[PDB]
Amino acid sequence: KGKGPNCYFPLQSYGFRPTYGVGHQPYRVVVLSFELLHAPATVCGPKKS
Amino acid sequence: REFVFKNIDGYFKIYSKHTPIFPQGFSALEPLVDLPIGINITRF
């Protein structure tokens, strides 16, 4: 019913600072997920001409 | 304004042609738009 015993906030903030070590620097991560459903492949790689 | 809609192999193709002035002529409909969406179309 509120902040107190056995009730902790599940979200925590990073607080990035430029003087931190290499292990604590902010790293933007992008994950490419490919789908192979039964449909025409509208996405393809570049083709050299 | 004549239109033909067909769905085959997941590609949705349309055909159209504009002509002035119904059965007193002959004109073939040229392809205009072809979009692969692959959805099942039963009613329109």
Return the residue matching tokens 């902010």: A26
- A5-26 burial code (b ≥16 CB/10 A, e <16): eeeeeeeeeeeeeeeeeeeeee
Instruction: Give the residue numbers in A contacting B (CB under 8 Å), as ranges.
Output: 38-40, 42
Nearest to B30 by CA among B9, B1, B20, B11: B1
How were these coordinates obtained? cryo-EM
Whether A42 and B36 lie within 8 Å, measured CB to CB:
yes
Look up residue A35 and give its two tokens: 């789908």
Alpha carbon A17 to chain centroid, angstroms = 19
A4, β-bridge pairs: A7
**Rg, C-alpha atoms of chain B:** 13
d(C-alpha B14, C-alpha B16), whole Å:
7
d(C-alpha B3, C-alpha B32), whole Å:
10
